């Protein structure tokens, strides 16, 4: 269970410095796993019989293209599928776009997501994005998507218009901000959309787990921006196998209760014990992950649930 896909966050370094960035990525970001350690991880994931998809994220994965192509080439003999996400800064040159698409097509890259919005706009020109989107027409086996992070004051309405006909046939999704990283301090909270509240608990369910080996050296149960500020980690030692990561994910009591009972199990404990204000749990949220982030972003918060999770285990199994 949860062992057919894995993600690696290659680095926190990025050419951009978006004001919403969950990692606060910038050209001077230093948080990353060693290159040799990542090589060993990719080699293991490629040799693993159950993994089908390996996803790469950052930071900006195309910043050190030589290392990315080297990692994709370790996977090549094993025939696993690859997904990539990028700010498309490399789209500036049609010749680079041609080179990278040719590489991606021969290295079993099945999906490429390009992020572009008013937060990315100061660092990447619209023309770079257009170049990538137009050339993708020649590679129908690569799934192309455009991810746009928006706020009430920065809805990216003019950005799509300026992309012109390059967006024809491309899946576009506009999404709200998770109040984590640079979004916590550089964006007014009144500009973040509020779709959920502590009251409509019936819809508070985690979308699912997806293992990520993050640039901070930890392992996370999902790839949501919110998880990275939590203390929920699947790593117990420096050299830990994927089998052990999956076994830890599948035997984690907190994640088991979260999957089976939903966020209402944790929220009702805090309401019953009058800890919503003490734990700084927000009243409204842009997404379900926003609740997740605030329930478990400290060791005190997680440890608070232990006697209740212990009682749950005894009662149910």
């Amino acid at each position: 269970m949860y062992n057919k896909t894995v993600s690696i966050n290659l680095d926190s370094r990025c050419n951009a410095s978006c004001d919403h960035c969950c990692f606060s990525s910038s050209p001077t970001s230093t948080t990353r796993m060693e290159k040799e350690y990542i090589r060993e991880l990719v080699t293991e994931f490629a040799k693993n019989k159950t993994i089908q998809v390996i996803s790469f994220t950052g930071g900006e994965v195309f910043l050190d293209y030589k290392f990315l192509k080297e990692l994709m080439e370790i996977i090549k003999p094993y025939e696993k599928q690859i997904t990539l996400i990028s700010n498309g800064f490399w789209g500036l040159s049609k010749k680079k776009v041609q080179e990278y698409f040719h590489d991606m097509n021969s290295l079993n890259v099945i999906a490429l997501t390009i992020s572009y919005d008013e937060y990315h706009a100061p660092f990447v020109k619209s023309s770079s994005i257009k170049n990538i989107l137009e050339h993708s027409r020649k590679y129908p086996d690569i799934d192309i998507s455009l991810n746009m992070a928006v706020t009430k004051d920065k809805m990216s309405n003019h950005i799509l218009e300026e992309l012109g006909d390059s967006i024809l046939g491309v899946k576009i999704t506009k999404f709200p901000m998770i109040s984590v990283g640079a979004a916590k301090t550089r964006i007014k909270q009144e500009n973040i959309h509020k779709f959920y509240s502590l009251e409509d608990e019936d819809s508070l369910h985690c979308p699912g787990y997806d293992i990520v080996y993050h640039h901070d050296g930890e392992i996370y149960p999902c790839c949501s921006p919110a998880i990275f500020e939590t203390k929920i980690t699947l790593r117990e030692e420096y050299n830990q196998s994927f089998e052990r990561t999956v076994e830890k994910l599948n035997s984690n009591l907190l994640l088991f209760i979260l999957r089976k009972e939903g966020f209402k199990w944790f929220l009702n404990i805090l309401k019953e014990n009058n800890k919503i204000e003490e734990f700084d749990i927000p009243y409204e949220f842009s997404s379900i992950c926003g609740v997740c982030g605030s329930l478990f972003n400290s060791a005190e918060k997680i440890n608070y649930f232990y006697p209740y999770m212990e009682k749950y285990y005894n009662e149910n199994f």
């Binding site: 993600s7 966050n9 969950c22 996803s55 994220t57 997904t83 996400i85 997501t113 999404f175 998770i178 985690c206 979308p207 699912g208 787990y209 997806d210 990520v212 999902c222 790839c223 949501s224 921006p225 997404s287 379900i288 992950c289």
Partner: peptide, 7 residues
């Protein structure tokens, strides 16, 4: 869904 947001 949100579990594959940054990928």
């Amino acid at each position: 869904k949100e579990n594959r947001w940054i990928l």
